[PDB]
Design a protein around this ligand. Structure first.
Ligand SMILES: *[C@@H]1O[C@H](CO)[C@@H](O[C@@H]2O[C@H](CO)[C@@H](O[C@@H]3O[C@H](CO[C@H]4O[C@H](CO[C@H]5O[C@H](CO)[C@@H](O)[C@H](O)[C@@H]5O)[C@@H](O)[C@H](O[C@H]5O[C@H](CO)[C@@H](O)[C@H](O)[C@@H]5O)[C@@H]4O)[C@@H](O)[C@H](O[C@H]4O[C@H](CO)[C@@H](O)[C@H](O)[C@@H]4O[C@H]4O[C@H](CO)[C@@H](O)[C@H](O)[C@@H]4O[C@H]4O[C@H](CO)[C@@H](O)[C@H](O)[C@@H]4O)[C@@H]3O)[C@H](O)[C@H]2NC(C)=O)[C@H](O)[C@H]1NC(C)=O
Ligand SMILES: *[C@@H]1O[C@H](CO)[C@@H](O[C@@H]2O[C@H](CO)[C@@H](O[C@@H]3O[C@H](CO[C@H]4O[C@H](CO[C@H]5O[C@H](CO)[C@@H](O)[C@H](O)[C@@H]5O[C@H]5O[C@H](CO)[C@@H](O)[C@H](O)[C@@H]5O)[C@@H](O)[C@H](O[C@H]5O[C@H](CO)[C@@H](O)[C@H](O)[C@@H]5O)[C@@H]4O)[C@@H](O)[C@H](O[C@H]4O[C@H](CO)[C@@H](O)[C@H](O)[C@@H]4O[C@H]4O[C@H](CO)[C@@H](O)[C@H](O)[C@@H]4O)[C@@H]3O)[C@H](O)[C@H]2NC(C)=O)[C@H](O)[C@H]1NC(C)=O
Ligand SMILES: *[C@@H]1O[C@H](CO)[C@@H](O[C@@H]2O[C@H](CO)[C@@H](O[C@@H]3O[C@H](CO[C@H]4O[C@H](CO)[C@@H](O)[C@H](O)[C@@H]4O)[C@@H](O)[C@H](O[C@H]4O[C@H](CO)[C@@H](O)[C@H](O)[C@@H]4O)[C@@H]3O)[C@H](O)[C@H]2NC(C)=O)[C@H](O)[C@H]1NC(C)=O
Ligand SMILES: *[C@@H]1O[C@H](CO)[C@@H](O[C@@H]2O[C@H](CO)[C@@H](O[C@@H]3O[C@H](CO)[C@@H](O)[C@H](O)[C@@H]3O)[C@H](O)[C@H]2NC(C)=O)[C@H](O)[C@H]1NC(C)=O
Ligand SMILES: *[C@@H]1O[C@H](CO)[C@@H](O[C@@H]2O[C@H](CO)[C@@H](O[C@@H]3O[C@H](CO)[C@@H](O)[C@H](O)[C@@H]3O)[C@H](O)[C@H]2NC(C)=O)[C@H](O)[C@H]1NC(C)=O
Ligand SMILES: *[C@@H]1O[C@H](CO)[C@@H](O[C@@H]2O[C@H](CO)[C@@H](O[C@@H]3O[C@H](CO)[C@@H](O)[C@H](O)[C@@H]3O)[C@H](O)[C@H]2NC(C)=O)[C@H](O)[C@H]1NC(C)=O
Ligand SMILES: *[C@@H]1O[C@H](CO)[C@@H](O[C@@H]2O[C@H](CO)[C@@H](O[C@@H]3O[C@H](CO)[C@@H](O)[C@H](O)[C@@H]3O)[C@H](O)[C@H]2NC(C)=O)[C@H](O)[C@H]1NC(C)=O
Ligand SMILES: *[C@@H]1O[C@H](CO)[C@@H](O[C@@H]2O[C@H](CO)[C@@H](O)[C@H](O)[C@H]2NC(C)=O)[C@H](O)[C@H]1NC(C)=O
Ligand SMILES: *[C@@H]1O[C@H](CO)[C@@H](O[C@@H]2O[C@H](CO)[C@@H](O)[C@H](O)[C@H]2NC(C)=O)[C@H](O)[C@H]1NC(C)=O
Ligand SMILES: *[C@@H]1O[C@H](CO)[C@@H](O[C@@H]2O[C@H](CO)[C@@H](O)[C@H](O)[C@H]2NC(C)=O)[C@H](O)[C@H]1NC(C)=O
Ligand SMILES: *[C@@H]1O[C@H](CO)[C@@H](O)[C@H](O)[C@H]1NC(C)=O
Ligand SMILES: *[C@@H]1O[C@H](CO)[C@@H](O)[C@H](O)[C@H]1NC(C)=O
Ligand SMILES: *[C@@H]1O[C@H](CO)[C@@H](O)[C@H](O)[C@H]1NC(C)=O
Ligand SMILES: *[C@@H]1O[C@H](CO)[C@@H](O)[C@H](O)[C@H]1NC(C)=O
Lengths: 240, 225, 134, 447, 213, 210
């Protein structure tokens, strides 16, 4: 049960620095190395470097040997075989080609010929580096449409428009609605704005028996928007 | 400091002896005053003491018959002793005590004690207890008769003591007042003789002054050959 | 590496196999106690160090009824059943420790003890007996 | 992929179990020449070269409050008292009638008693006298008194050739077992120790029986440690390891002496003869500056378990004197001191500091040690004055209960159970057995 | 990245597919160990093969590895629908770092194609109050990753304000995408109907909305 | 109550206290001469007030067992007195008793010849029907003196009142004897003689009625 959680997605100014964290659980944090691997749109995946939470021995990539520093915190013993550790990677002199998704990963084995190999990967940390200010989105409700006339299915959602920081999460009924939810990727405008749409497929008969609310959370702007989709359908294929 | 005692000299039994102590050279409210007596054939007996807070403590051998007080107005000390007997005939001194606290351990545990001691004393007043009565002394001059001696004989008195002076402070070198004798009559008698040069006779005056405080017999006798 | 008694208890199982002899001698003699403690509470230590001999001899006999005798590491002829652990080599000896491994065998250890003896050497010695006459 | 079972004898595997440990009499004490010490009666030599082995990557669970080494040590001390007090002179005939009278102080308590004892022969009888402190019952209330132990149990005098000086004792692990030791300095007491050593014998532990104030213990080397058995449950012991040692110097200055009175064929009873010199009770001095600093440090450390709650402490509850006193031993005499002025602080600054801080201390002679198989021991008197210096290194505290979540929390001294005294030194050790036989799949086969 | 892989390989459902991984004499094989990673874009990758041919814990024996003196190969036996994603290889030693390759996209053919579900949404009144108009055309559940969106304002093509997203792989082995048409209120009122036309490789789905409705 | 102690002249005298202290003590030494105020010699075991000579020392209180002893180095003829040891300690409470006196007798003193002076009765005494012959002896050491009376060389046995010898300022003894006679007995015998014998020195003075 080696689940490993990374830090949150951030937006930093070029020339500054940022420190990404990696908190572990389910195993002995001192038994396996911690690897850092980045992925940018330009050069694809690239291995940044690994560090040993036990001995402190590290191996950095020569490209990142200048502007990257890896550190680890001492593990907090929970049981005889599990602990809670943390690994930090601080990168400085941020540029444009460094915007992307960064991962920390657990090593494979404790001894052999491929010990440091990244085996368990975290959920990733999105890092954007630009001069544009953090702009919050404007959530709009979507009118229901007909998906199946003979079956009676409505499709209704929410539109998240105009925001600079990439990551934005959408839930339904505070997470109490997971069936039929489909969130589409964002879009790259000519102005540098991102916008996406989420849609849930509900029955056409559940208009007075269930309330559908979309919760849009945007952490880089620290904004929460709760929108109520109006059940008043407008498609001609659904009113019948 | 100076301490001078005073008393009646004679007290009848079943009465109350009383003595006074005049102090000089200091104050009376900042010191502690004790009384000491001495009976014939007995050592110094401790009577009691009085404090600066004007609180008194007496010897349990006196059977609570003693009582001490103070007098800051006249700067004097008092002592009274009720129900006197023949055994209370004594010379009474008043003395000054000085606090000394002998500590041999933790003061909080009470590992200390007080040890009474009195640096200053007085000459002491003599007081006799008898059912008899005082008698004036008969003073006779002894004419000189080649060794040059000039004496006065106090032939019969009671009780002791008797002060014999010679021209106040004009005769002190040759003065010799022999101790009194107890005759079988209960009457004391003494002789005070001086050595005067032979050439001084016929031209100089020599009187002996006799003071008997119990029974006022202040008598000055002029001696001539 | 040597490390010492119980040194490789956190090390991998393979690395701990190098020091089987170190943790073996510490199971028997703890240096002679010179003249004996006698007195009242001497029977306490006497029974506690007779039980040690009993346990050691029971282990040696469990070895002897198997093929493993006079040797620490010893291979046998019982195939590893998959329903035990269900893990690969190197997934074990390079990832696990001996404590963590013992944690995953106690459920099925009493049956492996049976297969290693009633079916292995009781058949093996029978074969060697029946094949040493012709 | 195609493996076979393989046997490995001697794998580093252990299992929690209970056993009876050994003991070491240090260097046998050849310089003392005396052979009347509880430990030197039956323990192995010291083995001058210890063997401590770090166990890398190991995190073992410990629980000082469920440690069996403590129970073993307590049972050993209990069964050792009786074995030490068995071939010694008993004072059963001394249960006679005593005349008794207070100390002279011709105008502190210690009675001057006289009794009709048996002489060297049993047909004749003589009368003796002795000073019996204060441990006497009024019988029926110069007033007739009675020895206190002639009510319940019996009395036996401690052998004068045996000394009550604590010798360093350390327990050794038997064959097939090992002692795991927590090397974490600032440790809970219960939980997973992040790095563990293994040993055969522990460190030289001195069996110092005491209450409230732990003496001659082991100082925690990084700040002070407050170890609980249950921080919510008020009826549990709270052990405190200090950082620095607090000097404590106790004295009985009263120049006494001993009388050897003959009672029976060949056994002589030692009693407290007449006092020679000034008389004064026992007393202990504890430097006020050091104790005030220790109090403020323990207070700041106690504010961790309670964020927004003020903490105060008062003296012991009262009643039973054995629980509410800093009882200990001092060259033979069992000093029972009062510790009210130690925990009556905050409102304490009289005389611009007490400089030395002196605590009154009585002495007893007839003790019942936790009712260990009944009986009672008469401590023989020591001729002369007595002085003993020691180091306070630990404390035993207890928290009050009730609707106390409002303002403050009270921490009064305690004790009673002598097992917590051993817990303050066996909190880091645990005894485990080795399971050397392991089986693992490998790539090999026989024949 | 000097470690060159295969550009894009196709496979048949139920059969096998082999990916190549080779590079210069400095960064390949013989002395170096090759590993393989299934890397779903936007999600965490998965270890499948390490040390040339040894699989990872939990990996089905369908995956196989091989290494020659000049190139390594990853063999995927019994192709599954969920096996249609990107695959990378790594060349490493015992104390070095991971050297990732170019990348290989594997397409699994022979599956039942899906009918693209297209839904068009006009802007709401809250957006009309902001003097903005955005038509949202959401496409979901189609198998071939090739769609072309055309926006027609009253049967007339629109070139400005069109922003089409790249197709992403749905969690149900399908694909989805979206297209946003940005229009001003003056252009929103001065037309009768708008049409989003998604031209599929074997069909065409058109959705028409009207500002008056 | 008096404890006699004879000490030779010039050497050192050691007067031991009468009561042994039971604990830490606080001893005082008082010097009381017959007819004079008692002097405080040593208080607080060894502290000496202003005026007391350095020849007097008291054993200070140290450890325990030391006996309170007053040491007089080089005694003189003027040191013969009563010595009181006021004993205080921690195990006797309030001590009212000054303790028994220790009268010091300095021996090895040069003797002196007894000076005798005889006085016949006075005229005012003869006219008062009384008669007393006064024999005054003074300045002699030691005090052993035997007074006798003779009348025309005939020993007078009755009517003799002789004081006990007592030294005065010069530390030499002085005694007085009185012969009580009637006026008709005084003129009766022609020569009355007081004959004193001190250390064998027999000196006699005679008077005659004139
Ligand atoms: C736990 O803590 C507690 C409390 O903290 C400790 O308890 C303490 O224990 C000690 C030890 O017993 C006790 O001391 C005894 O103390 C007394 C008194 O102490 C003092 O008083 C002296 C005099 O003071 C006063 O008089 C003067 C006039 O002279 C006046 O002006 C002043 O205002 C005041 O009224 C002080 O001089 C003295 O100061 C000095 O000495 C200290 C110790 O060296 C030093 O620390 C100071 O800095 C300062 O230098 C102090 O304040 C002591 O007198 C006594 O000593 C004697 O008694 C034993 C028998 O018990 C005897 O054998 C000794 O020889 C000694 O006796 C001398 O003094 C007598 C007069 O008092 C005299 O009669 C004797 O003949 C003898 O004299 C000769 O020596 C003196 C000098 O002493 C010399 O001048 C003479 O010429 C002659 O040669 C003890 O030491 C504490 O009282 C006690 N405290 C409490 C609160 O209970 C406990 O010990 C601790 N326990 C442990 C285990 O740690
Ligand atoms: C308790 O728990 C612990 C944690 O779980 C546990 O530790 C685990 O222990 C095992 C065994 O002890 C460890 O095992 C292995 O890992 C080694 C990793 O590395 C060594 O390399 C490190 C990184 O080196 C790079 O960076 C350095 C700078 O920091 C450079 O100087 C290096 O040159 C190297 O650089 C590379 O990259 C550059 C680009 O960045 C490039 O330019 C350059 O050219 C180069 O390619 C070093 O930091 C490290 O240094 C330490 O340790 C050694 C040994 O103690 C010291 O001598 C050093 O001074 C330094 O302190 C190491 O040098 C692997 O090397 C190792 O592999 C070899 O051995 C195994 C068998 O064990 C073989 O299967 C394998 O094939 C390798 O074999 C080869 O080497 C051996 C000699 O080692 C040789 O005989 C053989 O023939 C063959 O050639 C093995 O995989 C494991 O890492 C630990 N885990 C963790 C998380 O730390 C411990 O055991 C537990 N138990 C206890 C304590 O009792
Ligand atoms: C219980 O009983 C124990 C033992 O009997 C007592 O412990 C002793 O305590 C005293 C005082 O607390 C200690 O005495 C002190 O020693 C210090 C160290 O001494 C030397 O080392 C320095 C190192 O630099 C040298 O420079 C120096 O020359 C010495 O060689 C001294 O520093 C102390 O001095 C202070 O006073 C002097 C005198 O005025 C000054 O000159 C100094 O500058 C300084 O201010 C002091 O002398 C003694 O060492 C302790 N012994 C032991 C064995 O520990 C307990 O105090 C006692 N507790 C109670 C409550 O009663
Ligand atoms: C090194 O050994 C450890 C075991 O000590 C390996 O960890 C184990 O990995 C398996 C999967 O390979 C886990 O099984 C899973 O359990 C979860 C429980 O929720 C279940 O939902 C899954 O279906 C699966 O059965 C197992 O829990 C896990 N154990 C521990 C203690 O983490 C580890 O993978 C090994 N590392 C290697 C070989 O690199
Ligand atoms: C023999 O043993 C009995 C025990 O059964 C003794 O009786 C007990 O003596 C104690 C001591 O005083 C009593 O305790 C006290 O109670 C008072 C209030 O009554 C309290 O103020 C004290 O603090 C103390 O706690 C106890 O009550 C008493 N018990 C009985 C049942 O009488 C007895 O004293 C012993 N000695 C004999 C009989 O000579
Ligand atoms: C030795 O054992 C002790 C406990 O038995 C270990 O200490 C505990 O260590 C953790 C993390 O090192 C401490 O946690 C933290 O507390 C701070 C302050 O509130 C907080 O800001 C952090 O987020 C974290 O929660 C914990 O407080 C500490 N226990 C106590 C009672 O303080 C210690 O780490 C072990 N020694 C070594 C070298 O690891
Ligand atoms: C023994 O353990 C106690 C545990 O309380 C230690 O106490 C505290 O020690 C620290 C030093 O680590 C003191 O801190 C410092 O404070 C001063 C100001 O007083 C500041 O200038 C320094 O920069 C540092 O921050 C602290 O004051 C002290 N007391 C408390 C209540 O925390 C003690 O130091 C230990 N002693 C030894 C010898 O190990
Ligand atoms: C130190 O002691 C505390 C008190 O019990 C421990 O706290 C508990 O720890 C267990 C084990 O992880 C948890 O299940 C409980 O929920 C904890 N309760 C509280 C109130 O904290 C703590 O874990 C101990 N730490 C160490 C390192 O031993
Ligand atoms: C647990 O960790 C502590 C802290 O690193 C170790 O402590 C030191 O141990 C060494 C080895 O004996 C000593 O030389 C140092 O003086 C110790 N320092 C301190 C501050 O404790 C301890 O040894 C470790 N124990 C184990 C079993 O690994
Ligand atoms: C305890 O009491 C006894 C007897 O009442 C005391 O002994 C008497 O002591 C005096 C003086 O020391 C002797 O003369 C007696 O002969 C003793 N009596 C007996 C019967 O021996 C004893 O002193 C008292 N204890 C103390 C410390 O004073
Ligand atoms: C493993 O043991 C189980 C239980 O006895 C048995 O059903 C199974 O067939 C065994 N497997 C092998 C491969 O022997
Ligand atoms: C001891 O016995 C005697 C009789 O020989 C008796 O008078 C005395 O009272 C007894 N002692 C006590 C303390 O009763
Ligand atoms: C600690 O105390 C709580 C409440 O008093 C209790 O529920 C719990 O069982 C205790 N834990 C122990 C004694 O280990
Ligand atoms: C603390 O001590 C002082 C002084 O003896 C006393 O007045 C006060 O009552 C004490 N406080 C307590 C709580 O006992």
């Amino acid at each position: 049960e080696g689940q490993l959680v990374q830090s949150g997605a951030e937006l930093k100014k070029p020339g500054a620095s940022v420190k990404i964290s990696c908190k572990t659980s389910g195993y002995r944090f001192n038994f396996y190395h911690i690897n850092w691997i980045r992925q940018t749109a330009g050069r694809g995946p690239e291995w940044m470097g690994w560090i040993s939470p036990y001995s402190g021995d590290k191996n950095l990539a020569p490209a990142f040997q200048d502007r990257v520093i890896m550190t680890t915190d001492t593990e907090v013993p929970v049981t005889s075989f599990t602990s809670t550790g943390a690994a930090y990677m601080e990168i400085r002199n941020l540029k444009f080609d460094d915007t992307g998704t960064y991962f920390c990963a657990k090593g494979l084995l404790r001894d052999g010929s491929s010990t440091w190999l990244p085996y368990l990967w975290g959920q990733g940390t999105l890092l954007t580096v630009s001069s544009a200010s953090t702009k919050g989105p404007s959530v709009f409700p979507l009118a229901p449409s007909s998906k199946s006339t003979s079956g009676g299915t409505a499709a209704l959602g929410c539109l998240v428009k105009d925001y600079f920081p990439e990551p934005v999460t959408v839930s339904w009924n505070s997470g109490a609605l997971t069936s039929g939810v489909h969130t589409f990727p964002a879009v790259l405008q000519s102005s540098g704005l991102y916008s996406l749409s989420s849609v849930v497929t509900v029955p056409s008969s559940s208009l007075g028996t269930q309330t559908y609310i979309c919760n849009v959370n945007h952490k880089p702007s620290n904004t929460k928007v709760d929108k109520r989709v109006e059940p008043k359908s407008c498609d001609k294929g659904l009113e019948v | 400091v100076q301490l001078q005692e005073s008393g009646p000299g004679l007290v009848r039994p079943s009465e109350t002896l009383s003595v006074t102590c005049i102090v000089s050279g200091g104050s009376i409210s900042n010191y502690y005053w004790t009384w000491i007596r001495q009976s014939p054939g007995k050592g110094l007996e401790w009577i009691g003491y009085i404090s600066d807070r004007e609180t008194t403590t007496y010897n349990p051998s006196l059977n609570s018959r003693a009582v001490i007080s103070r007098d800051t107005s006249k700067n004097q000390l008092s002592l009274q002793l009720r129900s006197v007997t023949t055994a209370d005939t004594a010379i009474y001194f008043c003395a000054t005590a000085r606090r000394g606290q002998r500590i041999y351990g933790v003061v909080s545990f009470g590992e200390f004690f007080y040890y009474y001691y009195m640096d200053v004393w007085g000459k002491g007043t003599a007081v006799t207890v008898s059912s008899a009565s005082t008698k004036g002394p008969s003073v006779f001059p002894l004419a000189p008769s080649g060794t040059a001696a000039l004496g006065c004989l106090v032939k019969d008195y009671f009780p002791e003591p008797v002060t014999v002076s010679w021209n106040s402070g004009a005769l002190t070198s040759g003065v010799h007042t022999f101790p009194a004798v107890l005759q079988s009559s209960g009457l004391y008698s003494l002789s005070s003789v001086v050595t005067v040069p032979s050439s001084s006779l016929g031209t100089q005056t020599y009187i002996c002054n006799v003071n008997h405080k119990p029974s006022n017999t202040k008598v000055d006798k002029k001696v001539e050959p | 590496v040597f490390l010492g008694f119980l040194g490789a208890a956190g090390s991998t199982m393979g690395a701990a196999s190098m020091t089987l002899t170190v943790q073996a001698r510490q199971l028997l003699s703890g240096n002679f106690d010179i003249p004996g403690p006698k007195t009242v509470w001497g029977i306490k230590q006497l029974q506690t160090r007779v039980l040690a001999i009993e346990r050691y001899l029971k282990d040696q006999q469990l070895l002897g009824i198997w093929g493993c005798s006079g040797k620490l590491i010893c291979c046998t002829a019982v195939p590893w059943n998959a329903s035990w652990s269900n893990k690969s080599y190197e997934e074990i000896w390079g990832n696990m420790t001996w404590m963590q491994w013992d944690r995953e065998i106690n459920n099925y250890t009493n049956t492996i003890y049976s297969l290693l003896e009633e079916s292995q050497n009781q058949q093996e010695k029978n074969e060697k007996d029946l094949l040493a006459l012709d | 992929g195609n493996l076979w079972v393989t046997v490995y004898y001697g794998v580093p595997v252990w299992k929690e179990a209970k056993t009876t440990l050994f003991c070491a009499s240090d260097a046998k004490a050849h310089k003392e020449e005396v052979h009347n010490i509880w430990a030197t009666h039956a323990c192995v030599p010291t083995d001058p070269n210890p063997q401590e082995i770090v166990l890398k990557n190991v995190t073992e669970n410990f629980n000082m409050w469920k440690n069996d080494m403590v129970d073993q040590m307590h049972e050993d001390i209990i069964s050792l008292w009786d074995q030490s007090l068995k071939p010694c002179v008993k004072l059963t005939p001394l249960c006679v009638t005593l005349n008794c009278s207070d100390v002279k102080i011709k105008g502190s308590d210690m009675k001057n008693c006289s009794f009709n004892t048996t002489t060297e022969i049993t047909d004749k009888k003589k009368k003796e006298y002795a000073l019996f402190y204060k441990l006497d019952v009024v019988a029926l209330d110069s007033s007739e008194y009675r020895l206190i132990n002639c009510n319940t149990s019996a009395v036996t005098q401690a052998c004068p050739k045996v000394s009550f000086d604590p010798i360093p004792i350390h327990y050794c692990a038997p064959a097939g077992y090992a002692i795991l030791k927590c090397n974490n300095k600032t440790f809970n007491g219960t939980g997973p120790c992040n790095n563990v050593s293994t040993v055969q014998c522990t460190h030289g532990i001195k069996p110092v029986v005491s209450t409230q104030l732990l003496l001659n213990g082991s100082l925690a080397e990084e700040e002070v440690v407050i170890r609980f058995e249950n921080l919510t449950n008020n009826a549990k012991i709270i052990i405190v390891h200090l950082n620095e040692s607090v000097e404590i110097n106790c004295t009985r200055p009263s120049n006494n002496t001993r009388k050897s009175v003959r009672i029976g064929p060949g056994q002589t009873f030692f009693a407290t003869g007449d006092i020679i010199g000034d008389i004064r009770q026992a007393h202990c001095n504890i430097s006020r500056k050091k104790w005030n600093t220790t109090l403020q440090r323990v207070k700041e450390k106690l504010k961790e378990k309670f964020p927004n709650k003020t903490i105060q402490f008062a003296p012991s509850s009262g009643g039973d004197l054995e629980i509410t006193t800093h009882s200990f031993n001092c060259r033979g005499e069992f000093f029972y001191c009062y510790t009210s002025d130690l925990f009556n602080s905050t409102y304490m600054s009289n005389n611009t500091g007490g400089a030395n801080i002196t605590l009154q201390c009585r002495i007893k002679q007839i003790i019942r040690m936790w009712q260990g198989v009944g009986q009672a021991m008469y401590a023989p008197p020591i001729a002369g004055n007595i002085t003993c210096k020691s180091n306070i290194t630990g404390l035993l505290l207890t928290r009050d209960g009730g609707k106390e979540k409002n303002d403050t929390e009270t921490f009064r001294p305690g004790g009673g159970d002598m097992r917590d005294n051993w817990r303050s030194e066996l909190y880091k050790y645990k005894v485990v057995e080795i399971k050397p036989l392991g089986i693992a799949p490998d790539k090999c086969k026989r024949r | 990245s000097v470690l060159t892989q295969s550009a894009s390989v196709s496979g048949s459902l139920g059969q096998s597919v082999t990916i190549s991984c080779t590079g210069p004499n400095s960064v390949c094989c013989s002395h170096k160990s090759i590993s393989w990673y299934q890397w779903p874009p936007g999600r965490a990758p998965t270890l499948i093969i390490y040390e040339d041919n040894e699989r990872a814990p939990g990996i089905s024996p369908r995956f196989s590895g091989y290494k020659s003196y000049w190139s390594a190969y990853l063999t995927i036996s019994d192709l599954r629908p969920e096996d249609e994603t990107t695959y990378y290889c790594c060349s490493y030693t015992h104390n070095s770092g991971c050297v990732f390759g170019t990348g290989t996209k594997v397409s699994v053919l022979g599956q039942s194609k899906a009918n693209p579900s297209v839904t068009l949404f006009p802007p709401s009144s809250e957006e009309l109050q902001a003097n903005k108009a955005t038509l949202v055309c959401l496409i979901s559940d189609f198998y071939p990753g090739a769609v072309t969106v055309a926006w027609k304002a009253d049967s007339s093509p629109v070139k400005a304000g069109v922003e089409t997203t790249t197709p992403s792989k749905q969690s149900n082995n399908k694909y989805a995408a979206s297209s946003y048409l940005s229009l001003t209120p003056e252009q929103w009122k001065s037309h009768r109907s708008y049409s989003c036309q998604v031209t599929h490789e074997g069909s065409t789905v058109e959705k028409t909305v009207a500002p008056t409705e | 109550y008096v404890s006699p102690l004879s000490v030779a002249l010039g050497e050192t005298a050691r007067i031991s206290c009468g009561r042994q202290a039971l604990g830490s003590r606080a001893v005082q030494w008082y010097q009381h001469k017959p007819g004079q105020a008692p002097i405080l010699l040593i208080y607080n075991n060894q502290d000496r007030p202003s005026g007391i000579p350095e020849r007097f020392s008291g054993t200070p209180d140290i450890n325990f067992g030391t006996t309170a002893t007053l040491t007089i180095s080089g005694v003189e003829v003027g040191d013969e007195a009563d010595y009181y040891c006021h004993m205080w300690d921690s195990r006797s409470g309030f001590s009212w008793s000054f303790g028994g006196a220790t009268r010091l007798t300095v021996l090895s003193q040069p003797k002196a010849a007894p000076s005798v002076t005889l006085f016949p009765p006075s005229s005012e005494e003869l006219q008062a029907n009384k008669a007393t012959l006064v024999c005054l002896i003074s300045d002699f050491y030691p005090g052993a003196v035997t007074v006798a009376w003779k009348a025309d060389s005939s020993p007078v046995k009755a009517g003799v009142e002789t004081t006990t010898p007592s030294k005065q300022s010069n530390n030499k003894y002085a005694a007085s004897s009185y012969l009580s006679l009637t006026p008709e007995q005084w003129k009766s015998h022609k020569s009355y003689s007081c004959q004193v014998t001190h250390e064998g020195s027999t000196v006699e003075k005679t008077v005659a009625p004139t």
